[PDB]
Amino acid sequence: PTVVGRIPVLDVRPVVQRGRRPAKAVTGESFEVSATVFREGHDAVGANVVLRDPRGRPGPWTPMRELAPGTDRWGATVTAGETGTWSYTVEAWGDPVTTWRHHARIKIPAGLDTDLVLEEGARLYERAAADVPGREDRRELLAAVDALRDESRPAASRLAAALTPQVDAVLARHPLRDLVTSSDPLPLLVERERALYGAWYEFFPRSEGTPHTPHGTFRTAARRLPAIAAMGFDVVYLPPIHPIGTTHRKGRNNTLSATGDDVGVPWAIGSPEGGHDSIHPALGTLDDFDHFVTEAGKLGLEIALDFALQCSPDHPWVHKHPEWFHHRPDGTIAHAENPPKKYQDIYPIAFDADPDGLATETVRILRHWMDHGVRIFRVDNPHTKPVAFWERVIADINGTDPDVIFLAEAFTRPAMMATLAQIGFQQSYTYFTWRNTKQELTEYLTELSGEAASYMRPNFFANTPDILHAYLQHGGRPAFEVRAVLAATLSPTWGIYSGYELCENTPLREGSEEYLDSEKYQLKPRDWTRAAREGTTIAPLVTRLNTIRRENPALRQLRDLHFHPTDKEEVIAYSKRQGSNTVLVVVNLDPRHTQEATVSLDMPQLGLDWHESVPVRDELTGETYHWGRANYVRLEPGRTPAHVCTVLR
Amino acid sequence: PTVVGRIPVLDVRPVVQRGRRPAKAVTGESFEVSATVFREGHDAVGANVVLRDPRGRPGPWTPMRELAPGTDRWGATVTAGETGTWSYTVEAWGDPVTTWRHHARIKIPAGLDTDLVLEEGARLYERAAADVPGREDRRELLAAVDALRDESRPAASRLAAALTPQVDAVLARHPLRDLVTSSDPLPLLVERERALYGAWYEFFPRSEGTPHTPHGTFRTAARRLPAIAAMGFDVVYLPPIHPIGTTHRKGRNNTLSATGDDVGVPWAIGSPEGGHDSIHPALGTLDDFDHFVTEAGKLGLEIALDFALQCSPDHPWVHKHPEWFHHRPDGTIAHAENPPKKYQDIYPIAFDADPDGLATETVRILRHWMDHGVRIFRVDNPHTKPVAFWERVIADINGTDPDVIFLAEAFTRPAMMATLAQIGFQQSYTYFTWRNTKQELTEYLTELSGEAASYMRPNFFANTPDILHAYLQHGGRPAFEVRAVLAATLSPTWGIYSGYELCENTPLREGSEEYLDSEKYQLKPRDWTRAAREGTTIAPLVTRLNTIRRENPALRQLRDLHFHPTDKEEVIAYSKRQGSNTVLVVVNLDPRHTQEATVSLDMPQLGLDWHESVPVRDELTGETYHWGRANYVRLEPGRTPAHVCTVLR
């Protein structure tokens, strides 16, 4: 057996890990399958994609086209259906009819061998006719065969009868394919919509309490849910809900020693009261949690729980499984670190003495929470545990429960970030927060919407408890408005951490990305009512963004994205499409100064001619414009951060 | 069972066809193996390359280094030995000693836990000692262990005793490696020196005849061999040596109808006198050929025969194997083409009726010529026969005869060119002749010396019978001098077609790359003696170039190559290295005007400091200079094309 087939079909993409891990999609998502296809000699080739579902059934006729002239790179768009493990193959073949046609068009006017040429075409068309199941379509091709062979008619007339639109239409649907050659199948893991698309809201239940009982419970924290669903979110991400240790507990503002009433950091998991399978007694009981989850569901909210594989010094594991920790020679366990950040309040796990015990327990924990309706886990700092540990765990859980979604909070280097997604994390946190210029934003989203989309699905949290960017610190409310538009229009999954709406932007100190008086170390009650009546919240903008996303398929996908040029460095423009839905966005990245610019649209990239002028609606205001090749915009910070326009049908 | 190992080692390179075809080397050739290596958490990793020979034996300790900070990309150089099929693995591991050292250097001055830290280092070094086979080296590490544990000594003193050069030296050779993880093996095909390195001379024996018998024979053509060996060539490439057909024979200057004396084109193979396994009767017999090959061998010349899988209309195959041709409905066979070039004098082979019969016969033919000492085949237009056909043929021939070398004359698109090498062609013709500007030359050689060197070995023919470039037509002798220098210094294989030395540069007409009165269609006798006495030949330059190549290992490899900047667009500078041999070349690409420029050497890329001034010798003249960071040159066309300098040790 040779490595190349009769008709070379090489380097099929997408490919992950040389085919050892699957490429990714979700239900209804489209993406481009490509390959390098060519043949010996000078005759024409064709190619098509054969997409096979989990039961092995082939999809529709999906012909490919060469993507640029002389490159021999071919592509076609395919669309995932139901969830599960799919496969894709590229078939390449000689296209003798295209070849003949080319030669005929030249030879026949030139009077060169007209009878031999026309007979050769007749025999090609007959072979094509012998495969066509339709009787009418067969009749049509035999009628052309007859015409081609009618030696009483003029050459150019005979030929023209084989080149009619209705002959072309038959041949486009049922082409004569010589020497069909296939690649080896590549795998596609198709998952549920939410893996790609969803809006996320993070908050700490404990901060939503009362004057009598400041430490909120699941019963009191439930009252925040309706407001969260009303802002248009689909997922509520909770920090750790377990008991919190006392030894080395952190006080307010990341101070080393807690005082008597300090609540500590939820990520310092575990005490004599319980570990990762338990509920912090101040939040209530498992039954209260079930109530929280039921009420979330009725509002169309799924819960994502935080999963942090680490322990406070008081976690039961410390004495029950000492070999899950690395001990120094005096028996002590060094506290966890991410230099120059220190986590004095927790111990890191050691994985190499009892990897089987750790796997078994981890998945029991996850299954416990799964039995209570948590189908989405936000995994804390996954890059500080072994990659192969996550690979085995996710495989074990998705083996019985494929719907479960894991989000990797890996703010680390590219290689680890990529690899974590490739070994099975459905979603990933990203570098979004550190992309604020037009050049940074354009470069990064080109990367994320390109080849990386075959393995990574990004979750653009405009802020987190650990990340308050200088852009927001220095920008104020207009900056919060911009970042919200960007996140919500550039990724089909975005998120905010509670307080973002209120434009909280006081840092711990100059040049830090920590908040001052961070909610990680203290209860942080918020006057939601006042903010709403005094209009000091960007909650209405947030709500509108999620509505626009729910109303526009283009914003619920990642891969179709194009950046259109402008004459201003502060002003950025882009478009996204899904079927006939097209969304066009123009953002002023300057939060302090009004910017006026000219936006030059790539009209073909919108599916229009250059001279066309088509109507749009700015969905933020309801206002209408007529836009084309070049357009003046004027964006005043505070009044408008951006135009988020749909192209009107 | 997981795809990722305990310590991630990913995307090992070189890789060809995802591991389905081997990466390439020759004996004594060095190249970089790389991989992406990292781990969970913050501790250090290390990595090494394990090269395994055909009998499975591991090479030496070959430690890798990260190639750029923060990239997680690691590399080391390896060197191929004997010929055959090898394998390479990258091993990745935790490097606990580097990690410990880092922490110690900080903690010990800071007075933090000095006893615990020093004991932890002691126990690492003890484990390191248990692996070390050397007794002296073991003693050295245990002495450090003792020092580290000597609680009577100052902390910083204890530490310093574990960081001495002689401790480092032991640890560099025998490191403590945690959690060793390997990539899956990748294949390497190591072939003989001539596959990469060699100088080629093409001529037509029939042109070297006598006044009585103008049509030269193998006996008369042999007289040219001594002069070819004296110019320093290693390989003589002969056009087809078989009988030439009569039907549709071409006349002089590619005219359609031959007249009574016209000899025709050697590529129009076959007549009633014989086919591809026969000798043209006007060249003599097989015994005469044996004499030619024997005399070539005594002069250190190997012969490459042309292999052109195509027929004249009078080849016996036409009636013996009609199913090896495609016949039109009237029974005729369309003559071969490469549009807009037509080959009326030959029929192309059809491969799909009797592929097995074509394979069997092709390899019998090659083996015939092999039994007569032809161990190199120049394959004519391989891209017009199926890629899998070439794969099967080369594999069959190299299966029994691994020393045989095949050169692909595929002047075609990148995909086919790349693939033909990857399926087993040892060498390839290239775009060299159409790369004449500094930008073209720099770009193309960066490509050839980069990733493509894992599968493709280039053969830079400065001219061929089918390619007389405009640069030579418009440049005259100074152009010939430049192109020679380039070809000979940029590739470890180069070549010329007879008459190049005489600066023959008259095209068929303006804007053609054909020679006027081309040797393909006529006997072309040359007064070699007169040209030598009158100095109208660049044979002395050619000879000097081949001597320089024979005297300098740097020019017998491809992959080590760097372009140094200059302030003149017409002047190009580059360097190549192999061990302590460094060659530096500066060429004036302008054949009409003197050019003066400043050449700014990347001194580190030469292995020197910026301020250093190294002596060089221009090997073309014998003159000596002292060169460094910035150097004035002045290059007068006709007097000097280039400086070809060796850096003096």
Ligand SMILES: OC[C@H]1O[C@@H]2O[C@H]3[C@H](O)[C@@H](O)[C@@H](O[C@H]4[C@H](O)[C@@H](O)[C@@H](O[C@H]5[C@H](O)[C@@H](O)[C@@H](O[C@H]6[C@H](O)[C@@H](O)[C@@H](O[C@H]7[C@H](O)[C@@H](O)[C@@H](O[C@H]1[C@H](O)[C@H]2O)O[C@@H]7CO)O[C@@H]6CO)O[C@@H]5CO)O[C@@H]4CO)O[C@@H]3CO
């Ligand atoms: O006949 C049309 C063509 O004519 C002229 O081209 C010259 C050229 O200027 C000469 O130097 C020489 O070209 C060499 C190249 O130097 C050499 O690299 C190689 O070419 C290969 C390319 O390097 C490789 O990329 C590929 O080319 C593709 C290419 O990527 C595509 O873009 C596409 O090319 C089109 C051109 O864009 C288009 O403008 C025109 O080209 C003119 C050109 O302007 C003019 O100066 O047509 C082509 C579309 O067919 O297609 C090609 C694939 O065919 O592969 C090629 C080699 O196949 O080899 C050539 C010559 O052997 O010679 C040409 C004239 O022969």
Ligand SMILES: OC[C@H]1O[C@@H]2O[C@H]3[C@H](O)[C@@H](O)[C@@H](O[C@H]4[C@H](O)[C@@H](O)[C@@H](O[C@H]5[C@H](O)[C@@H](O)[C@@H](O[C@H]6[C@H](O)[C@@H](O)[C@@H](O[C@H]7[C@H](O)[C@@H](O)[C@@H](O[C@H]1[C@H](O)[C@H]2O)O[C@@H]7CO)O[C@@H]6CO)O[C@@H]5CO)O[C@@H]4CO)O[C@@H]3CO
């Ligand atoms: O001196 C340290 C460092 O401090 C400052 O970094 C800022 C930065 O300006 C902020 O925007 C943000 O950084 C983000 C990045 O925006 C984000 O991309 C990501 O960074 C990743 C990179 O994308 C990726 O390339 C890789 O980084 C490697 C890098 O390729 C290496 O070249 C090497 O970088 C060195 C730099 O040459 C040097 O400038 C300095 O870095 C500064 C930085 O200039 C400055 O603005 O030192 C490093 C050598 O340590 O190393 C890194 C790997 O460490 O992976 C990173 C992943 O981090 O994420 C960061 C935030 O993590 O925040 C930082 C504040 O630290």
Ligand SMILES: OC[C@H]1O[C@H](O[C@H]2[C@H](O)[C@@H](O)[C@@H](O)O[C@@H]2CO)[C@H](O)[C@@H](O)[C@@H]1O
């Ligand atoms: O109590 C443990 C630890 O939690 C925090 O750090 C988290 C952080 O919030 C996550 O976003 C990510 O960086 O992982 C960290 C560890 O789980 C606190 O900020 C930290 O001070 C605290 O010690």
Ligand SMILES: OC[C@H]1O[C@H](O[C@H]2[C@H](O)[C@@H](O)[C@@H](O)O[C@@H]2CO)[C@H](O)[C@@H](O)[C@@H]1O
């Ligand atoms: O005899 C056929 C054909 O020979 C020449 O074309 C060659 C060319 O020289 C080869 O090196 C390569 O390109 O393939 C061709 C045929 O094998 C002549 O140039 C041409 O006129 C002639 O028809």
